[PDB]
Amino acid sequence: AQKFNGLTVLPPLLTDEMIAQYTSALLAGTITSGWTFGAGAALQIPFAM
Amino acid sequence: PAYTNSFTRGVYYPDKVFRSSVLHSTQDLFLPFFSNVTWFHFDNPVLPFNDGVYFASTEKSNIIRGWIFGTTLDSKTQSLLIVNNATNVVIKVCEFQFCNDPFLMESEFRVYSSANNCTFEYVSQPFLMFKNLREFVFKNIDGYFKIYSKHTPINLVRDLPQGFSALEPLVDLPIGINITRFQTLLALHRGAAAYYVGYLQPRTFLLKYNENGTITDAVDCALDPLSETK
Amino acid sequence: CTLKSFTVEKGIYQTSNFRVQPTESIVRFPNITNLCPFGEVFNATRFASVYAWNRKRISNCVADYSVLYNSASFSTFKCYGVSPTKLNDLCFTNVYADSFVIRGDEVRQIAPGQTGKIADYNYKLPDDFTGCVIAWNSNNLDSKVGGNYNYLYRLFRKSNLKPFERDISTEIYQAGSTPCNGVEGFNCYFPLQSYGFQPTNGVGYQPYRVVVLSFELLHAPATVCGPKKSTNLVKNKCVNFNFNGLTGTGVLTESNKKFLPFQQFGRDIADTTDAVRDPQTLEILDITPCSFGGVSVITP
Amino acid sequence: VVNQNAQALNTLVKQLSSNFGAISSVLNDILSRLDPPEAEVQIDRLITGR
Numbered sequence: 263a264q265k266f267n268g269l270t271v272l273p274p275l276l277t278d279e280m281i282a283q284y285t286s287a288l289l290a291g292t293i294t295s296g297w298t299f300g301a302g303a304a305l306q307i308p309f310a311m
Numbered sequence: 312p313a314y315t316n317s318f319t320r321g322v323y324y325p326d327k328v329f330r331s332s333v334l335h336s337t338q339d340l341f342l343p344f345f346s347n348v349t350w351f352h353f354d355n356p357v358l359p360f361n362d363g364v365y366f367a368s369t370e371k372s373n374i375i376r377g378w379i380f381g382t383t384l385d386s387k388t389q390s391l392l393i394v395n396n397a398t399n400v401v402i403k404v405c406e407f408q409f410c411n412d413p414f415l416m417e418s419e420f421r422v423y424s425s426a427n428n429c430t431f432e433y434v435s436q437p438f439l440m441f442k443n444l445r446e447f448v449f450k451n452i453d454g455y456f457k458i459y460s461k462h463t464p465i466n467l468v469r470d471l472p473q474g475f476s477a478l479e480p481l482v483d484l485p486i487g488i489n490i491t492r493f494q495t496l497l498a499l500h501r502g503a504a505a506y507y508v509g510y511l512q513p514r515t516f517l518l519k520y521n522e523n524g525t526i527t528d529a530v531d532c533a534l535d536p537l538s539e540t541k
Numbered sequence: 542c543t544l545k546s547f548t549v550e551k552g553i554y555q556t557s558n559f560r561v562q563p564t565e566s567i568v569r570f571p572n573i574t575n576l577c578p579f580g581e582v583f584n585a586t587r588f589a590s591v592y593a594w595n596r597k598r599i600s601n602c603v604a605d606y607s608v609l610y611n612s613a614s615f616s617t618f619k620c621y622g623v624s625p626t627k628l629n630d631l632c633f634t635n636v637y638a639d640s641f642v643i644r645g646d647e648v649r650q651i652a653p654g655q656t657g658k659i660a661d662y663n664y665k666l667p668d669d670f671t672g673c674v675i676a677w678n679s680n681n682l683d684s685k686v687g688g689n690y691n692y693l694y695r696l697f698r699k700s701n702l703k704p705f706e707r708d709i710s711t712e713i714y715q716a717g718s719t720p721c722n723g724v725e726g727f728n729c730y731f732p733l734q735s736y737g738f739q740p741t742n743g744v745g746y747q748p749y750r751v752v753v754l755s756f757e758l759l760h761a762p763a764t765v766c767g768p769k770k771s772t773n774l775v776k777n778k779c780v781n782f783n784f785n786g787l788t789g790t791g792v793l794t795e796s797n798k799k800f801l802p803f804q805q806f807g808r809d810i811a812d813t814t815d816a817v818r819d820p821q822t823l824e825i826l827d828i829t830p831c832s833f834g835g836v837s838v839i840t841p
Numbered sequence: 842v843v844n845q846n847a848q849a850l851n852t853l854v855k856q857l858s859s860n861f862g863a864i865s866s867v868l869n870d871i872l873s874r875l876d877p878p879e880a881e882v883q884i885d886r887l888i889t890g891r
């Protein structure tokens with residue numbers, strides 16, 4: 263809300279930039295390695311197979 | 312007779328406090344939306360006051376030049392007079408007796424009959440210099456006698472135009488008198504002219520303020536169930 | 542101190558708050574010098590009866606109530622809506638003055654919302670009355686050895702009287718169905734009665750002089766108040782301010798919003814005072830809350 | 842969610858204008874018009890409501 267007396271707001275710890283970076287990393291992992299990167303080290307594999 | 316629709320007119324600033332870009336709800340005396348207003352011309356009968364009156368006058372109607380308020384003509388109690396002339400306005404409150412049908416190649420005043428026990432005699436600035444329409448609002452609470460008006464040009468004579476208007480608190484006095492009736496005043500040279508009368512009744516209204524702080528729109532909270540939802 | 546321990550682990554903790562303190566204090570009042578006439582309100586001799594109570598509307602002055610504090614001649618002094626000592630610097634729109642004469646014992650029924658013959662029938666004081674009343678004995682003047690009968694009051698009437706009314710008509714009281722028409726029959730009574738003031742009467746029967754002062758606080762600009770001195774204004778810093786009784790703390794700043802000529806101050810959001818018109822230069826000053834915030838301490 | 846937080850916050854802010862049976866909703870007026878030994882009985886009834 264706007265500025266007045268009594269109360270204030272606090273910014274979140276993670277900015278929108280970091281959340282977008284996390285989502286981009288997740289998308290890259292799931293399109294380049296399937297489910298392998300969730301269990302452990304990422305394994306490269308083409309999308310068709 | 313000749314009752315006419317009010318067409319969402321007659322609102323005023325109630326609190327004399329600046330507000331801007333906010334919606335506020337107030338409860339005060341107001342003229343209900345879409346109510347009857349009484350049309351007069353050739354004649355000027357007496358009417359009761361009835362806890363507030365809304366007044367108006369059409370453009371080019373130079374005949375109307377003042378008002379008068381009281382309870383009895385016999386000069387038994389206190390009574391008020393307002394008369395406009397070329398240089399000032401005559402605002403005196405004193406126990407006058409009055410001519411029943413006065414008038415204001417030219418002719419002049421013929422109004423008073425007697426005077427005694429006066430209380431207030433200030434001379435003030437005159438409120439007037441497809442023509443201009445006139446609106447006025449009068450009420451009495453706590454002995455105080457607020458006057459509201461705003462002057463504006465319109466293009467039609469024998470009707471009340473649409474649109475919105477809100478009136479400002481121009482002048483105010485602690486007369487403390489008991490008003491029950493009133494009368495208008497007309498000028499004559501030695502001639503009919505339209506004016507309208509409406510009565511107030513306390514209802515809760517919602518007011519809209521624009522960015523400049525003036526009144527731009529308003530709704531009545533008891534007219535329409537849709538307005539109740541609003 | 543906050544965590545109640547001699548050792549604290551690594552982290553961040555909220556301890557307390559801070560506020561910027563004001564550096565000066567400024568007072569503003571209109572420059573008006575004329576003294577309005579309290580002289581013929583208390584030292585005057587021509588006063589009226591109970592039901593003929595005098596009406597005086599006094600404005601456009603400055604007043605010093607120190608005469609009311611220290612004059613021992615005033616027998617009783619009981620204010621209500623405000624503390625008596627504070628009238629020296631509060632500022633008021635208008636002051637109402639009433640004067641009338643009451644027998645001493647009926648002083649207690651001149652009270653906010655009190656019940657009594659004079660209260661219900663002559664002069665009733667409203668519940669939310671924000672003023673003050675003064676009274677003192679006057680047996681030395683309003684009494685004659687042969688008895689003074691010039692003072693009258695009305696005590697037979699049907700209904701209660703509204704807070705601010707006056708009646709002087711003395712129509713015969715129709716206590717019964719008989720239309721006696723101006724003759725006091727057994728079924729009729731004359732509404733008036735006179736107090737028989739004599740110097741031999743008891744102290745309770747001795748006459749008393751009563752003056753009533755009432756105040757109201759509206760949004761209209763004030764006209765009458767005390768002689769508190771004004772001073773120059775300070776801008777762009779946290780400072781205490783006083784404007785015709787309106788007090789607070791904030792930062793004064795120029796404004797771009799335009800007030801109407803009949804407007805004085807603003808309450809734009811949640812009834813908060815954000816702008817105040819300067820009584821001297823007529824320029825609108827913005828009010829800004831003084832800076833504040835929390836304190837957090839980072840420790841390893 | 843955003844609206845239902847905003848309305849709650851706005852209603853919390855608006856509650857500061859309530860009177861709670863006192864002679865005035867502004868605390869500065871309370872402590873500038875009255876003598877404290879009879880002004881605390883006016884302050885407490887605002888304190889409880891807030």
Ligand SMILES: *[C@@H]1O[C@H](CO)[C@@H](O)[C@H](O)[C@H]1NC(C)=O
Nearest residue numbers: 314315316317345346347348
């Ligand atoms: C005005 O009053 C007349 C009767 O006096 C009534 O017939 C008419 O409906 C009223 N006007 C409106 C808009 O209701």
Ligand SMILES: *[C@@H]1O[C@H](CO)[C@@H](O)[C@H](O)[C@H]1NC(C)=O
Nearest residue numbers: 396398399400401402434435
């Ligand atoms: C107009 O009325 C004022 C009173 O308000 C009076 O002093 C003045 O002389 C009048 N002028 C004329 C021309 O009647």
Ligand SMILES: *[C@@H]1O[C@H](CO)[C@@H](O)[C@H](O)[C@H]1NC(C)=O
Nearest residue numbers: 386387406425426427428429
């Ligand atoms: C008021 O005027 C009337 C006549 O108009 C007069 O009889 C009466 O005495 C006056 N009032 C006072 C208080 O003088």
Ligand SMILES: *[C@@H]1O[C@H](CO)[C@@H](O)[C@H](O)[C@H]1NC(C)=O
Nearest residue numbers: 382383488489490491492703
């Ligand atoms: C005003 O006068 C009328 C009669 O003209 C009367 O009935 C009424 O009681 C008086 N007082 C008020 C407050 O209306």
Ligand SMILES: *[C@@H]1O[C@H](CO)[C@@H](O)[C@H](O)[C@H]1NC(C)=O
Nearest residue numbers: 521522523524525797798799
């Ligand atoms: C205020 O009114 C003026 C006309 O007088 C208009 O031009 C302007 O847009 C309005 N708003 C502001 C913020 O000035």
Ligand SMILES: *[C@@H]1O[C@H](CO)[C@@H](O)[C@H](O)[C@H]1NC(C)=O
Nearest residue numbers: 570571572573574820821822
């Ligand atoms: C206060 O003083 C200023 C300058 O000293 C002056 O212009 C102003 O008119 C005074 N106020 C009044 C109400 O006369």
Ligand SMILES: *[C@@H]1O[C@H](CO)[C@@H](O)[C@H](O)[C@H]1NC(C)=O
Nearest residue numbers: 579580583584585608612614
């Ligand atoms: C009344 O006059 C006397 C005599 O001059 C004076 O001492 C006193 O202050 C005046 N005022 C009052 C309230 O007694």
